[PDB]
Design a protein around this nucleic acid. Structure first.
Lengths: 75, 76
DNA sequence: ATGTGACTTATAGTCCGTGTGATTA
DNA sequence: TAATCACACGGACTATAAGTCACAT
């Protein structure tokens, strides 16, 4: 159980949904399997930084904004 | 290899030194091996979020702090 | 559109070391 | 004498992430 990891996964889901995207959409765009993405959102996967960097590209977001957004999800 | 990995491994090493801690010290406070902290600093090495989370605790800074500094060091 | 258990390969991360170039004596 | 210190790097592990799937929702 990690505080940071479940914030990171909540932030990912949020953005994806804000932007009206599906997992299949985020998957194609980060070049990750869409069942991998589902595992990440359900907080059952401790992704690495390389993986996280592809997700960000996949959300069509900068690293700076994603982290800003993450510090905003941390409250 | 990865952009974000070099920045993350840079900021870790910076803060570490700004608190005059050793790699041995950081390893001990983070519950990682000293040889792994060496690798993270030298070769960037693909940490997980959990292990980043532990290195933030061992550095003794808030998650917010770390990320604010991470942002800055990407902005050239 | 998405959750999940199962699986194999790849690599994250551990634990024993040695060597070099600085100290402090 | 040394004698620690701080780090790079090794070799050989072990633990877990990566990456994928059929079948269900």
């Amino acid at each position: 159980e990690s505080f940071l990891l479940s914030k990171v996964s909540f932030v990912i889901k949020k953005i994806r949904l804000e932007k009206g995207m599906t997992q299949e959409d985020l998957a194609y765009k980060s070049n990750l399997d869409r069942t991998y993405i589902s595992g990440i959102e359900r907080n059952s996967r401790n992704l690495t930084i390389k993986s996280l960097e592809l997700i960000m590209k996949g959300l069509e977001v900068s690293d700076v904004v994603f982290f800003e957004m993450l510090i905003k999800e941390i409250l």
